[PDB]
Subunit: 256 residues, 4 copies
Amino acid sequence: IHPKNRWYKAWEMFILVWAIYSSLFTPMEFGFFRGLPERLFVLDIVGQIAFLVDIVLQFFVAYRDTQTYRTVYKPTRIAFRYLKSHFLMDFIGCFPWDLIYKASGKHELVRYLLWIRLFRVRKVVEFFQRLEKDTRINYLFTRILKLLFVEVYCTHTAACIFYYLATTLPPENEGYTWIGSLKLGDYSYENFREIDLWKRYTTALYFAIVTMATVGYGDIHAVNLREMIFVMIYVSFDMVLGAYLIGNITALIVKG
Amino acid sequence: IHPKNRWYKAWEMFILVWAIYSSLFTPMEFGFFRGLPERLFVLDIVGQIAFLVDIVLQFFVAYRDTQTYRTVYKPTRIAFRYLKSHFLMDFIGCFPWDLIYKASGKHELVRYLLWIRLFRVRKVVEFFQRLEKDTRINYLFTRILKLLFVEVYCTHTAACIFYYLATTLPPENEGYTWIGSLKLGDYSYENFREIDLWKRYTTALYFAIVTMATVGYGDIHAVNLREMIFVMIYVSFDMVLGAYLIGNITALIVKG
Amino acid sequence: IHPKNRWYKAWEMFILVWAIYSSLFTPMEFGFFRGLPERLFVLDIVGQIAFLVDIVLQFFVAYRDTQTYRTVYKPTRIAFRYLKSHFLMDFIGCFPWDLIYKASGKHELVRYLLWIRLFRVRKVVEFFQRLEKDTRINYLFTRILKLLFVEVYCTHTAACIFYYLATTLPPENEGYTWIGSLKLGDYSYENFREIDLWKRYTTALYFAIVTMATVGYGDIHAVNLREMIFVMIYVSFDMVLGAYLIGNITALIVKG
Amino acid sequence: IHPKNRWYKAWEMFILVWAIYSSLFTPMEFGFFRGLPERLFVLDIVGQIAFLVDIVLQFFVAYRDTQTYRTVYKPTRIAFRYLKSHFLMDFIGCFPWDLIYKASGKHELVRYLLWIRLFRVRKVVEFFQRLEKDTRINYLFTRILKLLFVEVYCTHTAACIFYYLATTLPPENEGYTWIGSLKLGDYSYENFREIDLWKRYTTALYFAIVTMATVGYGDIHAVNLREMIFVMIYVSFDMVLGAYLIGNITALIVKG
Ligand SMILES: [K+]
Ligand SMILES: [K+]
């Protein structure tokens, strides 16, 4: 397959949108849902098959030889390259990990395996790499946009994990978590497993976002020991991320 | 009209002062007032007619040709240029948007339309551009002053919007907002729609200012779900603004 | 007088120490004391006479001509230069402003005049200028040390002013201030005008210091409307100061 | 002894691991333990004897001559160099400072002397110096990693000291400390000297880490006057450390 082909470019954009959706949904899937509900069933399936098509197409596309800028259309070379680079993980990731979880005795570890899907963000990474290679956009502006996307995605994933760490404790001993002890205004999170999904997600995202900016107000904070450790890890990584963002912005203004 | 004319320069300064007042007052107009009170009536009218005169004058003045530095005084060219660039928005914004709101059944969308008047900040933007063009002031210092003004104005507008988001909820369900749940010292905001305008404005501005500096104390925070989303958007934009300011300062120090 | 004379250098160091003490004490004098207590009386007088001697000596020393590097010892030139630049304010600030306050009906404005002494920091400013001129120390390191001293001194002055703003309210209506509403641990600041000076000073300095670093915990915050305005001004100035410090550090690492 | 000898390199790595352990444990030993519990007895002795062996070996190895790059193996020179630079305090710190404390009337000052052992971090310092000398790693990346390690270690030591400052007060007057007044969720630190070591350490580390990132939430803050002073010193030093880290990152991005 000719790499720049008009149809292949459209397929790349389509799979990029699907990858963005899957990367944004999988942490939500794992954290806010101890097993998918019925309505999204078919949705999950089509996503899988969509990525399946991508696999059955990834065996066909020719690859640029990095050391020597020469295209290769031999099927053996491309097959072997896919085999070593990005085959086993995509295959193990597009398995149906929800029906497996429900059927196989509801063992959590098999869902813990649901995080295996996150390397679909490699599609967005390659998107940003191509955008950097393009001359219409400045290199450092592309780098900063990539960093902003990375910060937003890490904040979203951290919010999902932070909510998940509240469901680890038994439901009876729930007042000892970050959520369930909140009393914002007149609303008290008495039973936080019966509230609407969007309310809990927005609360967790609000906490994660105000922690990343470094405002830290203090209305939502850590109570458990696991939540404390997660908060320390998150802020330690966030500080370096923010320093890097400031560094690239300063670099463009100084040199660009 | 000769572009550099002494009288036209005085008119430009007068319109700049009026535009600064209008830009600082329109968010206050929209947020803190569900309809103007009677006292400022004539004041509002005066501003409108002033800008009307500006529009009448904006047609007469000749324009500089950017691609080829030749000044052209033909009325048709300046008329067409003003028609294309900055005519429709200025006129639609110079309509009386207060008496219309009161007469036409007190509908909210027409008052939402009052935000059109913020395009008068283009006058301050052009003023800073002229200051940058002037050789008496360093370019990066001008950029940093512009950035500081942008940060202050965005903080003021964010404070106005944050107070407005508290009035969206019905008056009976008011303890579920950022204001109305405050208990700073001995003063509790029991009925926050009966307090003086300056107290509410100062409280909102205090919250917005301590959120922008990133102190985030935590005496004033978000409670509603709409307030949470607004806070996330505010801090996400403010982080980039502050990083840009730090980059500009470091740029002048390193290079200048 | 020969500018580099060994005795004059010792006198300069002596007056530098006295100026540092006076600059650190005058905000404390104004804020924490509605009139000096008896014990420090003679101390105050001593400082005055010391600075008196300084100005008496300052009329004698020769001055360097910046435009043309030619030293002048003609007393008329140095006398006129001192009359022009730095005479009137030192004289008016070296008046006894405590006995004047106590004798003249305890009027508050004459005590507000006590802030004139803050221009003794010009001694430290010139000290840092000389240190920058010296080749033993790197220029940007000297600039950063000066910036850190400025930040610390501004924090100390802001703490003094913040405590003073709590004493403007009447003693009966004291629970509406930043102090007097504190309940840190088991200690409640019931009557904050009868507590030891060091406790109140340390509380105010703790608030100011954690506001400057941008931690902002939220145990000590603003309640009054005047305190809110002071906090906004302080954080707005502190943000620029911190950005400048980051810029200078980055400059030395990048270029030095 | 030949400096680059592989057995000596293995010994250096072994002593480096022991030094990392000792540096991470000594603040914990001093703060969280008023005398070691019996179980770690032999462990302590082992560390001591290990460092003893290091001292015994440190005499044998030849030293690089900095001014003139000639290797000298004469035992008198390496001896005198060790006697001058880094022995007296290595030995004084290699003394058994726990059994001394228990036997000699449980006097606190000899335990304060336990802080001498922190200069085993010179091993990690020389670790990073050699890594900087190595050409496989960029110099500024090595500096950034060293700064990150310094920040983490200073945070750990500050957490240990902050917990120690809570034990200085008598156990009866314990509610006036940073710990013992905590009411995180349903858990109240009623008697904080009976809780598990890991819970107290994690709480102190959580406070120190969120103070360093500058989030400052406000659930754990200072109450005592000693804690206030320690917090001011910590944040004043941490601000400079963070500015230095941002400067190094920006320099690497701009120049490298
Ligand atoms: K806070
Ligand atoms: K903060």
